[PDB]
């Protein structure tokens, strides 16, 4: 019938199906997954061994 059992979320999207499960879990600002993705993007090459590129040692080969 008429759109009486209709609702919208905080972002302006409307759901017209009373039996459709609405998405949830949007109230946790600064989500941990977002923080992990941000760390992966803004800080690449973290934990890499670059000590070899500033070594003045003429011998770069390890032998017994």
């Amino acid at each position: 019938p008429d759109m009486v059992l209709a609702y919208s979320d905080e972002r302006g999207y409307f759901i017209f199906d009373p039996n459709e499960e609405p998405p949830t879990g949007s109230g946790n600002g600064e989500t941990a997954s977002q923080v992990e993705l941000y760390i992966d993007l803004t800080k690449p090459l973290e934990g890499a061994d670059f000590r070899r590129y500033e070594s003045p040692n003429p011998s770069t080969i390890t032998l017994p």
């Binding site: 879990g25 946790n28 600002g29 989500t31 941990a32």
Partner: protein, 51 residues
């Protein structure tokens, strides 16, 4: 019997701290309790005594 496998669900941010938790729901079921057995009061000293 698994209600859900091991998974992480993120918590709310109430300060300058990032929090999350890991959950698992289940229970072990043994249909025949008389088809198992246990040994009790076993003695074992692998790092034994010398002398």
């Amino acid at each position: 019997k698994q209600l859900t496998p091991m998974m992480k669900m993120d918590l709310a941010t109430l300060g300058p701290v990032i929090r999350w938790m890991i959950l698992m729901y289940g229970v072990p079921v043994m249909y025949a309790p008389k088809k198992f057995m246990k040994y009790t009061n076993i003695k074992a000293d692998v790092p034994g005594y010398i002398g």
